[PDB]
Scaffold this active site. Structure first.
Site, PDB file in Angstrom:
ATOM      1  CE  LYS B  43       2.382  -4.669   2.356  1.00 43.37           C
ATOM      2  NZ  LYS B  43       2.004  -5.245   3.688  1.00 43.37           N
ATOM      3  CB  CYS B 130       7.615  -4.711   8.900  1.00 42.03           C
ATOM      4  SG  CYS B 130       6.997  -6.278   8.251  1.00 42.03           S
TER       5      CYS B 130
HETATM    6  C1  LIG Z   1      -2.953  -7.742   6.655  1.00 43.35           C
HETATM    7  C2  LIG Z   1      -2.158  -6.529   7.280  1.00 43.35           C
HETATM    8  C3  LIG Z   1      -1.123  -5.909   6.545  1.00 43.35           C
HETATM    9  C4  LIG Z   1      -0.472  -4.848   7.127  1.00 43.35           C
HETATM   10  N1  LIG Z   1       0.514  -4.217   6.384  1.00 43.35           N
HETATM   11  C5  LIG Z   1       1.176  -3.119   6.911  1.00 43.35           C
HETATM   12  C6  LIG Z   1       2.161  -2.500   6.032  1.00 43.35           C
HETATM   13  O1  LIG Z   1       2.513  -2.824   4.890  1.00 43.35           O
HETATM   14  N2  LIG Z   1       2.763  -1.372   6.612  1.00 43.35           N
HETATM   15  C7  LIG Z   1       2.505  -0.833   7.886  1.00 43.35           C
HETATM   16  O2  LIG Z   1       3.067   0.159   8.293  1.00 43.35           O
HETATM   17  N3  LIG Z   1       1.566  -1.515   8.618  1.00 43.35           N
HETATM   18  C8  LIG Z   1       0.860  -2.619   8.228  1.00 43.35           C
HETATM   19  N4  LIG Z   1      -0.096  -3.244   8.998  1.00 43.35           N
HETATM   20  C9  LIG Z   1      -0.341  -2.733  10.260  1.00 43.35           C
HETATM   21  C10 LIG Z   1      -1.445  -1.654  10.243  1.00 43.35           C
HETATM   22  O3  LIG Z   1      -1.141  -0.534   9.448  1.00 43.35           O
HETATM   23  C11 LIG Z   1      -1.954  -1.305  11.632  1.00 43.35           C
HETATM   24  O4  LIG Z   1      -0.830  -0.563  12.169  1.00 43.35           O
HETATM   25  C12 LIG Z   1      -2.388  -2.570  12.490  1.00 43.35           C
HETATM   26  O5  LIG Z   1      -3.138  -3.548  11.811  1.00 43.35           O
HETATM   27  C13 LIG Z   1      -2.959  -2.023  13.788  1.00 43.35           C
HETATM   28  O6  LIG Z   1      -4.299  -1.491  13.430  1.00 43.35           O
HETATM   29  P1  LIG Z   1      -5.719  -2.249  13.555  1.00 43.35           P
HETATM   30  O7  LIG Z   1      -5.874  -2.523  15.008  1.00 43.35           O
HETATM   31  O8  LIG Z   1      -6.809  -1.338  13.079  1.00 43.35           O
HETATM   32  O9  LIG Z   1      -5.603  -3.481  12.698  1.00 43.35           O
HETATM   33  C14 LIG Z   1      -0.819  -4.369   8.456  1.00 43.35           C
HETATM   34  C15 LIG Z   1      -1.833  -5.005   9.171  1.00 43.35           C
HETATM   35  C16 LIG Z   1      -2.504  -6.059   8.599  1.00 43.35           C
HETATM   36  C17 LIG Z   1      -3.640  -6.717   9.398  1.00 43.35           C
HETATM   37  O1  LIG Z   2       3.382  -6.952   5.400  1.00 42.15           O
HETATM   38  C1  LIG Z   2       3.468  -7.354   6.586  1.00 42.15           C
HETATM   39  O2  LIG Z   2       3.699  -8.508   6.977  1.00 42.15           O
HETATM   40  C2  LIG Z   2       3.307  -6.333   7.706  1.00 42.15           C
HETATM   41  C3  LIG Z   2       4.060  -5.204   7.766  1.00 42.15           C
HETATM   42  C4  LIG Z   2       3.885  -4.261   8.866  1.00 42.15           C
HETATM   43  O3  LIG Z   2       4.534  -3.227   8.973  1.00 42.15           O
HETATM   44  N1  LIG Z   2       2.898  -4.628   9.812  1.00 42.15           N
HETATM   45  C5  LIG Z   2       2.099  -5.783   9.785  1.00 42.15           C
HETATM   46  O4  LIG Z   2       1.246  -6.041  10.655  1.00 42.15           O
HETATM   47  N2  LIG Z   2       2.344  -6.630   8.684  1.00 42.15           N
END
Ligand SMILES: Cc1cc2nc3c(=O)[nH]c(=O)nc-3n(C[C@H](O)[C@H](O)[C@H](O)COP(=O)(O)O)c2cc1C
Ligand SMILES: O=C(O)c1cc(=O)[nH]c(=O)[nH]1
Ligand SMILES: Cc1cc2nc3c(=O)[nH]c(=O)nc-3n(C[C@H](O)[C@H](O)[C@H](O)COP(=O)(O)O)c2cc1C
Ligand SMILES: O=C(O)c1cc(=O)[nH]c(=O)[nH]1
Ligand SMILES: [Mg+2]
Ligand SMILES: [Mg+2]
Lengths: 311, 311
Positions: B43, B130
């Site tokens: 994370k 983010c």
């Molecule tokens: C609940 C949640 C938490 C996330 N936390 C991060 C994070 O800490 N760091 C990051 O680079 N991306 C984070 N993302 C973004 C994802 O890594 C990913 O780029 C995004 O959800 C797009 O992919 P998906 O279509 O498969 O969900 C998060 C997404 C979700 C849904």
């Molecule tokens: O922790 C989050 O809110 C978060 C970070 C990030 O880079 N991407 C995202 O969708 N959520």
């Protein structure tokens, strides 16, 4: 129930076509006039007639659409002649909307000057977001260029004017744009144009589905509703009340319309869904929205307009 | 069939979790290690442990997800201590990825210096996108600030480094970013983070569905695949070959994975789908991709990697 006041004009309902869809020719426009749409807008025009990009340029997708039309249009003079003539006729409730998308600042100024000098009494929409012109990015992503253009426009344009904006995804961008737009006697902001430069792939053929720009095109439909609603809402809480909003993006059902109105949109435009269904969509969606209102005991859009609740 | 070489390291397959999903605690990480995922990432961490934004902050949607977690994490030291002890066990095929998302440039530089000074031999991912920290816009939408930060980073960081990027929607932006990135010995670019500041509404309650930022949150899932694929492809044709790509966004099926690989992605990350299904998703999607390859007569990803055809 859907009676709407916008730009100091009255409309039977808030629904309209989105520029670019079902509004290329006089025939298309007359079909929109005959439909139940509260109002309609012309295809974005350029000074002269334009061919557009090579086909296929539009493809229907399960969750929406992808397109790179390339601004095909019959030219400024063609559309101005139609609106002037349907203006003299007094044959509709509410003014016609006229969209322009010059391929240069000088071109936009020239068309705006022509509209200002003409007898046109309707509404004009300046398109600052076409994402399908090769080598010409979305102007509204260049804050300096946008403010410079609008400052020149307002030194002479006194008629109702709105701007068609691309979607923004950073809150600071909404702040910057709101601060630029709030200084002008702008009639409205229309959010949003298609989500730019997306890609759709046919996995079996291992290829893209549209010919222009290596398959990259504007995305519309269900894919973009979250973005569209966010843009409408973000501007609603930042724009001075004098500037109203037209909500566009992902509108297919009465519920989608209800959501845009909750966010603060006053007029609503339908693109992808209209492209697929034809003008009959207006009667369907009007009935769907009225049913939602009836179930809630609402007799006017004012009963819920902009009332989206936060948690 | 899915054996992959990335960052000069060997992985059994290209699949990984997307940062933020199923990687908050050591327990979560151990579950990813036990799964069929080719690699995994932590994370995004900050110098101090963070509680995150008020709940509800995540909601499952028919077409994806919306979230405004707010970077809840156990702190940089917690994750560093973990990866440093795991590395010593030599219990897995391929390095662990370590994500950092400092609250400020100073915080990112401090964490990168600690990683550089440590014995960490894995891969680091700098999150410049983010979209959920109140008052902290996506750094990668500020090209000047991004280039400035990276220039300082590379005056001392010699270990493998990738950057997690927000989605772009204008071709000129891909050109600018590519020009900036190509001047550095970066290991990779990860496109894309969630589509920022979207909005989802419950029409019956006439309210948003997440508590932070008046309901505005990052959008993931099916909604964003067109954008995700476009970003992967746009950077694939612009980045110098030394900078590889990790594709993220809308990956749920073997077909979605195949599409990202066709665009040029080398590693693949799953966010929303993993959040909903759990680690069992890796075994399912691996088989789906292998079945697609078998039908096409492919025995290696090299048989179609980056081979997306234009019309
Ligand atoms: C609940 C949640 C938490 C996330 N936390 C991060 C994070 O800490 N760091 C990051 O680079 N991306 C984070 N993302 C973004 C994802 O890594 C990913 O780029 C995004 O959800 C797009 O992919 P998906 O279509 O498969 O969900 C998060 C997404 C979700 C849904
Ligand atoms: O922790 C989050 O809110 C978060 C970070 C990030 O880079 N991407 C995202 O969708 N959520
Ligand atoms: C085939 C097509 C042509 C379009 N042409 C224009 C145009 O000329 N001017 C403009 O401002 N928007 C144009 N748009 C964008 C729409 O007006 C609308 O903003 C977009 O499709 C998002 O709405 P939707 O989700 O209902 O499709 C076009 C969209 C499509 C699909
Ligand atoms: O004609 C086009 O290509 C076009 C223009 C515009 O503004 N938006 C869109 O999606 N397509
Ligand atoms: Mg009519
Ligand atoms: Mg394993």
């Amino acid at each position: 129930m859907l009676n709407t006041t916008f730009a100091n004009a009255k409309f039977a309902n808030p629904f309209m076509n989105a520029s670019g869809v079902h509004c290329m020719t006089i025939e298309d426009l007359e079909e929109l006039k005959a439909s139940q749409a509260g109002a309609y807008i012309t295809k974005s025009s350029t000074l002269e007639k334009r061919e557009g990009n090579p086909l296929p340029a539009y493809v229907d997708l399960e969750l929406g659409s992808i397109n790179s039309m390339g601004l095909p249009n019959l030219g400024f003079d063609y559309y101005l002649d139609y609106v002037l003539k349907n203006q003299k006729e007094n044959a509709q409730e509410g003014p016609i909307f006229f969209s322009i998308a010059g391929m240069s600042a000088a071109e936009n100024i020239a068309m705006l000057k022509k509209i200002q000098e003409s007898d046109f009494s309707g509404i004009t929409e300046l398109n600052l977001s076409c994402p399908n012109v090769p080598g010409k990015p979305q102007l509204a992503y260049d804050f300096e260029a946008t403010e410079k253009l609008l400052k020149e426009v307002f030194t002479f344009f006194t008629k109702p004017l709105g701007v068609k904006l691309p979607p923004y995804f950073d809150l600071v961008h909404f702040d910057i744009m709101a601060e630029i737009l709030n200084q002008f006697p702008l009639t409205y902001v229309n959010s949003v144009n298609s989500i730019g430069n997306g890609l759709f792939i046919d996995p079996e053929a291992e290829s893209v589905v549209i010919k222009p720009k290596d398959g990259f095109g504007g995305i519309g439909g269900a894919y973009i509703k979250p973005t569209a609603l966010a843009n409408v809402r973000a501007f609603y809480t930042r724009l001075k009340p004098e500037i109203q909003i037209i909500g566009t993006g992902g509108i297919e059902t009465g519920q989608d319309a209800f959501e845009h109105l909750l966010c603060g949109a006053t007029m609503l435009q339908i693109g992808t869904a209209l492209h697929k269904e034809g003008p009959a969509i207006f009667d369907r969606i009007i009935k769907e929205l009225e049913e939602i209102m009836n179930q809630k005991g609402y007799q006017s859009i004012a009963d819920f307009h902009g009332k989206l609740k936060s948690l």
